[PDB]
């Protein structure tokens, strides 16, 4: 029990883009109560071996931080879709079009332009004018929020228990609201 | 993420659009407005505004004393504003039945 | 009316036609934003309330 | 009580700002960038039970 704990699974909030609280993997447990010590040792050997991988994986993959479940991710931790600039070839030599049409020719259809060699292209940026910050998206949520192995659970001092496992915990206030 | 992608919370159009388009929109609001085609979120303030202690929005008081003379009537109320509350006196009125 | 006015009772009502009744999902019933504070205050995290 | 209606033709009309071809090309270039996606919400946003 206390020393080969079941990991806490992180639930997700796809609206906000944040963890939604956590509770243990109740949904994946080997029923050993009709085995003996010769095989319970092997089942514990598997459950121990799982927790080693979760600890290794959290250190490899998670962004090291002062809080589980922070309410707002800085624009340097959020992954951003920053494509290259987009270039377009402008379809008319506009200054020569006013010249030619003021001369009384009519221009219709279309690029090409037989009467002028001038082309121009301009290269706008495509990127969001400000970097995004706030919630994390689902492919980053899985890169964060590896399950939590929690040894000797609830043994420290209250007020540095894992309060943000609790779903309805207001980490901006360290408090808990009802329905109003 | 989906509240940010759908513009239910997060950045305004003048923040999330490319800077080329924002200067274009500004330069043409007269005479070809793009300013109804992009969602800006609006978001209520979640902290420091409303309490979540149990507490009445409206109080009714009854006269602690009253006088009923030939030409006028008096009533005395102990208007009690409790701790951590404030009363804009514009919200008060005397409710008379007769 | 008059000095022969009969004994009487009073009847009270209102009408409110093109309206709809509203009840905002807000920690007090003011509109402080389109995304109300209860709509983002711990009815989010699993929640699932009936 | 005898009412009826008969559609003899439906035709679709569309009006354009007669915009300069380099400007309209530039505006399209900007509006095809993924961060410049347009968005709308139904004015009565509700589920009509």
């Amino acid at each position: 029990s206390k020393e080969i704990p079941t990991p806490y699974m992180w639930s997700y909030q796809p609206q906000m883009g944040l963890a939604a609280g956590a509770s243990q993997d109740y949904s994946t447990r080997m029923n050993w109560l009709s085995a003996g010590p010769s095989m319970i040792s092997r089942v514990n050997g598997v459950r121990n071996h799982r927790n080693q991988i979760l600890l290794e994986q959290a250190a490899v993959t998670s962004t090291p931080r002062a809080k589980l479940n922070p309410r707002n991710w800085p624009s340097t931790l959020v992954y951003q879709e920053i494509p290259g600039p987009t270039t377009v070839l402008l379809p008319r030599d506009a200054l020569a079009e006013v010249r030619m049409t003021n001369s009384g020719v009519q221009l219709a259809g279309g690029g090409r332009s037989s009467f002028t060699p001038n082309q121009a292209y301009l290269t706008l940026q495509s990127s969001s004018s400000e970097p995004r910050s706030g919630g994390i998206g689902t492919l980053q949520f899985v890169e964060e929020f590896v399950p939590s192995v929690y040894f000797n659970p609830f043994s420290g001092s209250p007020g540095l228990y894992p309060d943000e496992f609790i779903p309805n915990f207001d980490a901006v206030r360290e408090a808990v609201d009802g329905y109003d | 993420p989906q509240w940010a992608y759908m513009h239910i919370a997060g950045q305004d159009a003048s923040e999330y659009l490319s800077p080329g388009l924002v200067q274009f929109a500004r330069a043409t609001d007269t005479y070809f407005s793009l300013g109804n085609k992009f969602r800006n979120p609006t978001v209520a303030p979640t902290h420091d505004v409303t309490t979540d202690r149990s507490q009445r929005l409206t109080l009714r008081f009854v006269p602690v004393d009253r006088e009923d003379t030939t030409y006028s009537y008096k009533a005395r109320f102990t208007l009690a504003v409790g701790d951590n509350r404030v009363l804009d006196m514009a919200s008060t009125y005397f409710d008379i039945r007769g | 009316i008059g000095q022969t006015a009969v004994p009487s009772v009073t009847q009270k009502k209102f009408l409110c036609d093109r309206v709809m009744w509203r009840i905002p999902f807000s920690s007090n019933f003011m509109s402080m934003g389109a995304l109300t504070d209860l709509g983002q205050n711990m009815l989010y995290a699993n929640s699932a309330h009936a | 009580d005898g009412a009826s209606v008969r559609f003899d033709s439906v035709n679709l009309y569309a009006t354009f700002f007669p915009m300069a071809h380099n400007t309209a090309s530039t505006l399209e270039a900007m509006l095809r960038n993924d961060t410049n996606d347009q968005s709308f919400n139904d004015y009565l946003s509700a589920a009509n039970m």
């Binding site: 001038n118 082309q119 290269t123 | 003048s14 924002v22 274009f24 043409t28 800006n40 | 709809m20 | -």
Partner: peptide
């Protein structure tokens, strides 16, 4: 009896707006 938000912003000389900075590579 329901809500939407429209996102306009502004700026012109007593003239009219042509658009701004050209990021052009020319020929």
């Amino acid at each position: 009896i329901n809500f939407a938000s429209l996102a306009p912003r502004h700026g012109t000389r007593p003239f009219m707006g042509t658009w701004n900075e050209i990021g052009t590579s020319q020929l």
